[PDB]
Design a protein around this motif. Structure first.
Motif, PDB file in Angstrom:
ATOM      1  N   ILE A 113       0.868  -1.154   0.000  1.00  0.00           N
ATOM      2  CA  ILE A 113       0.000   0.000   0.000  1.00  0.00           C
ATOM      3  C   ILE A 113       0.896   1.192   0.000  1.00  0.00           C
ATOM      4  CG2 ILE A 113      -1.895   1.364   1.174  1.00  0.00           C
ATOM      5  CD1 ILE A 113      -2.577  -1.084   2.890  1.00  0.00           C
ATOM      6  N   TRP A 114       0.658   2.142  -0.915  1.00  0.00           N
ATOM      7  CA  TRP A 114       1.293   3.440  -0.833  1.00  0.00           C
ATOM      8  C   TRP A 114       0.254   4.513  -0.467  1.00  0.00           C
ATOM      9  CZ3 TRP A 114       2.165  -0.142  -4.598  1.00  0.00           C
ATOM     10  CH2 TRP A 114       3.475  -0.561  -4.789  1.00  0.00           C
ATOM     11  N   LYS A 115       0.661   5.467   0.368  1.00  0.00           N
ATOM     12  CA  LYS A 115      -0.081   6.716   0.522  1.00  0.00           C
ATOM     13  C   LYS A 115       0.236   7.592  -0.705  1.00  0.00           C
ATOM     14  CE  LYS A 115      -2.845   9.474   2.836  1.00  0.00           C
ATOM     15  NZ  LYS A 115      -2.233  10.296   3.954  1.00  0.00           N
ATOM     16  N   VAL A 116      -0.810   8.177  -1.283  1.00  0.00           N
ATOM     17  CA  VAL A 116      -0.695   8.996  -2.487  1.00  0.00           C
ATOM     18  C   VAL A 116      -0.971  10.426  -2.109  1.00  0.00           C
ATOM     19  CG1 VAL A 116      -1.681   9.456  -4.837  1.00  0.00           C
ATOM     20  CG2 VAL A 116      -1.423   7.106  -3.867  1.00  0.00           C
ATOM     21  N   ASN A 117      -0.015  11.323  -2.390  1.00  0.00           N
ATOM     22  CA  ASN A 117      -0.210  12.749  -2.151  1.00  0.00           C
ATOM     23  C   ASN A 117       0.103  13.495  -3.407  1.00  0.00           C
ATOM     24  OD1 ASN A 117      -0.312  15.490  -1.355  1.00  0.00           O
ATOM     25  ND2 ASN A 117       1.325  15.302   0.183  1.00  0.00           N
ATOM     26  N   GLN A 118      -0.944  13.674  -4.200  1.00  0.00           N
ATOM     27  CA  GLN A 118      -0.851  14.367  -5.436  1.00  0.00           C
ATOM     28  C   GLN A 118      -1.218  15.767  -5.071  1.00  0.00           C
ATOM     29  OE1 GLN A 118      -2.695  13.834  -9.919  1.00  0.00           O
ATOM     30  NE2 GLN A 118      -3.195  12.426  -8.231  1.00  0.00           N
ATOM     31  N   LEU A 154     -21.125   7.641  -7.899  1.00  0.00           N
ATOM     32  CA  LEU A 154     -20.810   8.605  -8.883  1.00  0.00           C
ATOM     33  C   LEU A 154     -20.632  10.054  -8.379  1.00  0.00           C
ATOM     34  CD1 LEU A 154     -20.621   7.905 -11.985  1.00  0.00           C
ATOM     35  CD2 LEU A 154     -21.783   6.104 -10.468  1.00  0.00           C
ATOM     36  N   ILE A 155     -19.538  10.680  -8.797  1.00  0.00           N
ATOM     37  CA  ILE A 155     -19.413  12.127  -8.736  1.00  0.00           C
ATOM     38  C   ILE A 155     -19.269  12.669 -10.148  1.00  0.00           C
ATOM     39  CG2 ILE A 155     -18.672  12.287  -6.429  1.00  0.00           C
ATOM     40  CD1 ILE A 155     -15.681  12.490  -7.467  1.00  0.00           C
ATOM     41  N   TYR A 156     -19.659  13.924 -10.293  1.00  0.00           N
ATOM     42  CA  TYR A 156     -19.688  14.555 -11.590  1.00  0.00           C
ATOM     43  C   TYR A 156     -18.786  15.825 -11.650  1.00  0.00           C
ATOM     44  CZ  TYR A 156     -23.412  11.213 -12.213  1.00  0.00           C
ATOM     45  OH  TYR A 156     -24.159  10.034 -12.227  1.00  0.00           O
ATOM     46  N   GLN A 157     -17.959  16.004 -10.633  1.00  0.00           N
ATOM     47  CA  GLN A 157     -16.916  17.013 -10.645  1.00  0.00           C
ATOM     48  C   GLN A 157     -15.610  16.394 -10.102  1.00  0.00           C
ATOM     49  OE1 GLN A 157     -19.017  20.779  -9.280  1.00  0.00           O
ATOM     50  NE2 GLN A 157     -19.100  19.715  -7.310  1.00  0.00           N
ATOM     51  N   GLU A 158     -14.505  16.621 -10.794  1.00  0.00           N
ATOM     52  CA  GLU A 158     -13.203  16.050 -10.415  1.00  0.00           C
ATOM     53  C   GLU A 158     -12.726  16.504  -9.020  1.00  0.00           C
ATOM     54  OE1 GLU A 158     -10.794  17.121 -13.749  1.00  0.00           O
ATOM     55  OE2 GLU A 158     -11.799  15.771 -15.149  1.00  0.00           O
ATOM     56  N   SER A 159     -13.145  17.693  -8.594  1.00  0.00           N
ATOM     57  CA  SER A 159     -12.771  18.217  -7.295  1.00  0.00           C
ATOM     58  C   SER A 159     -13.341  17.457  -6.104  1.00  0.00           C
ATOM     59  CB  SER A 159     -13.174  19.699  -7.204  1.00  0.00           C
ATOM     60  OG  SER A 159     -14.578  19.871  -7.362  1.00  0.00           O
ATOM     61  N   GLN A 160     -14.339  16.589  -6.317  1.00  0.00           N
ATOM     62  CA  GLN A 160     -14.990  15.840  -5.219  1.00  0.00           C
ATOM     63  C   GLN A 160     -14.267  14.555  -4.782  1.00  0.00           C
ATOM     64  OE1 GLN A 160     -19.144  16.803  -6.777  1.00  0.00           O
ATOM     65  NE2 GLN A 160     -19.557  15.647  -4.874  1.00  0.00           N
ATOM     66  N   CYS A 161     -13.185  14.194  -5.496  1.00  0.00           N
ATOM     67  CA  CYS A 161     -12.334  13.074  -5.151  1.00  0.00           C
ATOM     68  C   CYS A 161     -10.922  13.580  -4.939  1.00  0.00           C
ATOM     69  CB  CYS A 161     -12.242  12.025  -6.298  1.00  0.00           C
ATOM     70  SG  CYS A 161     -11.123  10.602  -5.862  1.00  0.00           S
ATOM     71  N   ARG A 162     -10.268  13.027  -3.922  1.00  0.00           N
ATOM     72  CA  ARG A 162      -8.806  13.183  -3.706  1.00  0.00           C
ATOM     73  C   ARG A 162      -8.190  11.773  -3.604  1.00  0.00           C
ATOM     74  NH1 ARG A 162      -4.839  17.003  -0.024  1.00  0.00           N
ATOM     75  NH2 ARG A 162      -3.069  15.809  -0.954  1.00  0.00           N
ATOM     76  N   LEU A 163      -7.156  11.455  -4.370  1.00  0.00           N
ATOM     77  CA  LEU A 163      -6.533  10.113  -4.254  1.00  0.00           C
ATOM     78  C   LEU A 163      -5.792  10.013  -2.931  1.00  0.00           C
ATOM     79  CD1 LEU A 163      -4.986   9.989  -7.777  1.00  0.00           C
ATOM     80  CD2 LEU A 163      -6.941   8.637  -6.970  1.00  0.00           C
ATOM     81  N   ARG A 164      -5.925   8.895  -2.257  1.00  0.00           N
ATOM     82  CA  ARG A 164      -5.330   8.717  -0.935  1.00  0.00           C
ATOM     83  C   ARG A 164      -4.402   7.514  -0.871  1.00  0.00           C
ATOM     84  NH1 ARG A 164      -5.198  13.455   1.724  1.00  0.00           N
ATOM     85  NH2 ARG A 164      -7.310  14.225   2.323  1.00  0.00           N
ATOM     86  N   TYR A 165      -4.738   6.403  -1.542  1.00  0.00           N
ATOM     87  CA  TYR A 165      -3.957   5.190  -1.433  1.00  0.00           C
ATOM     88  C   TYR A 165      -3.927   4.471  -2.775  1.00  0.00           C
ATOM     89  CZ  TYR A 165      -4.691   6.087   3.490  1.00  0.00           C
ATOM     90  OH  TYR A 165      -4.752   6.703   4.706  1.00  0.00           O
ATOM     91  N   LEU A 166      -2.799   3.772  -3.000  1.00  0.00           N
ATOM     92  CA  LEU A 166      -2.616   2.857  -4.105  1.00  0.00           C
ATOM     93  C   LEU A 166      -2.200   1.513  -3.556  1.00  0.00           C
ATOM     94  CD1 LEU A 166      -2.381   2.389  -7.312  1.00  0.00           C
ATOM     95  CD2 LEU A 166      -0.009   3.301  -7.092  1.00  0.00           C
ATOM     96  N   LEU A 167      -2.843   0.450  -4.039  1.00  0.00           N
ATOM     97  CA  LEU A 167      -2.589  -0.890  -3.574  1.00  0.00           C
ATOM     98  C   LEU A 167      -2.127  -1.732  -4.726  1.00  0.00           C
ATOM     99  CD1 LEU A 167      -4.833   0.346  -1.694  1.00  0.00           C
ATOM    100  CD2 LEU A 167      -5.542  -1.982  -1.182  1.00  0.00           C
ATOM    101  N   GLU A 168      -1.069  -2.492  -4.475  1.00  0.00           N
ATOM    102  CA  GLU A 168      -0.690  -3.578  -5.372  1.00  0.00           C
ATOM    103  C   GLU A 168      -1.274  -4.855  -4.827  1.00  0.00           C
ATOM    104  OE1 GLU A 168       3.420  -3.812  -6.963  1.00  0.00           O
ATOM    105  OE2 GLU A 168       3.309  -5.970  -6.536  1.00  0.00           O
ATOM    106  N   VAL A 169      -1.907  -5.603  -5.708  1.00  0.00           N
ATOM    107  CA  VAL A 169      -2.591  -6.850  -5.338  1.00  0.00           C
ATOM    108  C   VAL A 169      -2.241  -7.970  -6.333  1.00  0.00           C
ATOM    109  CG1 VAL A 169      -4.555  -5.678  -4.134  1.00  0.00           C
ATOM    110  CG2 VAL A 169      -4.702  -6.293  -6.661  1.00  0.00           C
ATOM    111  N   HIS A 170      -2.112  -9.199  -5.829  1.00  0.00           N
ATOM    112  CA  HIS A 170      -1.785 -10.324  -6.661  1.00  0.00           C
ATOM    113  C   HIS A 170      -2.971 -11.311  -6.595  1.00  0.00           C
ATOM    114  CE1 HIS A 170       2.952  -9.748  -6.403  1.00  0.00           C
ATOM    115  NE2 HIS A 170       2.321  -8.649  -6.792  1.00  0.00           N
TER     116      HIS A 170
END
Ligand SMILES: C[C@H](NC(=O)CCc1nc2ccccc2c(=O)[nH]1)c1ccc(-n2ccnc2)cc1
Length: 354
Positions: free
Chosen positions: A180-185, A338-354
């Protein structure tokens, strides 16, 4: 005159991710999996102009599918001239249903992100003049303008995330958590700060192709003119990992099948619930901030927990899916958020899964 290549600063897991998400083989695989002719459309030849023309071609097909215009065959044939496809040198098939039209629109959307990753990797001028260069993986990481921090087993959010994965993933063959990575864009921070008064935040899954991960890390989750699906022109999430996992293709690496999934914090605000498909939506109804196509099941709300992210409480489901009697007749087996504006989501985590 020989430049010094500086040692890599990245941990092995991050090196692997950065290798994977910029891999020419991965991109070409993805093109082959979408039926594209990689010999006629090599990565270095993909252009924004080409992609634009392909979308215009699909626009003309969409018009025909709703006069004495060109037949669907002729207009398809134009599209295929613009975007070469491979069907074992047989003649590709006419785009003659709404379903196939959206499949081609989605293919071009993927291809647009492949082209972005190529454009992103173009060697700049300062890079040609400096006498020392970063390791290629440091360089590729830096291009993302996105901070990734690999988490260990005792990070405060780690068990909560693992629990969300395990409890809402497939019962018989749940994806196996690797990293798991924390994502701070950054530059997501300000637009998302806009919705700070909007309560009802939820941490939600967004599964994708490996070929669009670099683009997402550079730019966040996005809505395009041709974005579409069962709940219209927005950004799609799921509260059940198993729903989002259906969208992960996953690439064969050695004896494993590697895939990536995001967790986004979504400011859902006031929810509009639906129980039937509506591909024509472009925003929530007046007075609402999101649309939730409610499934037959939902992760058990009595088990929801919270994380604190940038000083806000964010709901994280922890429960196995249970039936929701009010939505037993829904067209959706599992919920789509569903959201209809890009500002309503913030990326927080990325997971690698097998
Ligand atoms: C075609 C691809 N779509 C996805 O990756 C959607 C993945 C997805 N769909 C869901 C639908 C319902 C519920 C959950 C999911 C989900 O987790 N992922 C895509 C869509 C848009 C873009 N894009 C955006 C800007 N430029 C290109 C690039 C790729």
């Amino acid at each position: 005159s020989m430049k010094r290549v500086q040692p890599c600063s990245l941990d092995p897991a991050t090196q692997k991710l950065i290798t994977n998400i910029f891999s020419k083989e991965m991109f070409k695989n993805t093109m082959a999996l979408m039926d594209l002719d990689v010999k006629k459309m090599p990565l270095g030849k993909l252009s924004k102009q080409q992609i634009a023309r392909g979308f215009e071609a699909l626009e003309a097909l969409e018009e025909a599918l709703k006069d004495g215009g060109q037949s669907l065959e002729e207009l398809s044939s134009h599209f295929y001239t613009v975007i070469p496809h491979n069907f074992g040198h047989s003649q590709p098939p006419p785009i003659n249903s709404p379903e196939l039209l959206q499949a081609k629109k989605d293919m071009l959307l993927v291809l647009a992100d492949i082209e972005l990753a190529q454009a992103l990797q173009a060697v700049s001028e300062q890079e040609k003049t400096v006498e020392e260069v970063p390791h290629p993986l440091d360089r590729d990481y830096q291009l993302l303008k996105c901070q990734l921090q690999l988490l260990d087993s005792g990070a405060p959010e780690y068990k909560v995330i693992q629990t969300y994965l395990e409890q809402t993933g497939s019962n018989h063959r749940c994806p196996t958590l690797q990293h798991i990575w924390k994502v701070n864009q950054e530059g997501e921070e300000d637009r998302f700060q806009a919705h700070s008064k909007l309560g009802n935040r939820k941490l939600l899954w967004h599964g994708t192709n490996m070929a669009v991960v670099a683009a997402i890390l550079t730019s966040g989750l996005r809505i395009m003119p041709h974005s579409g699906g069962r709940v219209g022109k927005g950004i799609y999430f799921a509260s059940e990992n198993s729903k989002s996992a259906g969208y992960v293709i996953g690439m064969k690496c050695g004896a494993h099948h590697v895939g990536y999934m995001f967790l986004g914090e979504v400011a859902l605000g006031r929810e509009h619930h639906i129980n039937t498909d509506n591909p024509s939506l472009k925003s929530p109804p007046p007075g609402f901030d999101s649309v939730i196509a409610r499934g037959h099941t939902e992760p058990d709300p009595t088990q929801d927990t919270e994380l604190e992210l940038d000083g806000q409480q964010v709901v994280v489901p922890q429960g196995q899916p249970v039936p929701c009697p009010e939505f037993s007749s829904s067209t959706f087996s599992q919920s789509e958020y569903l959201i209809y504006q890009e500002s309503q989501c913030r990326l927080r985590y990325l997971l690698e899964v097998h």
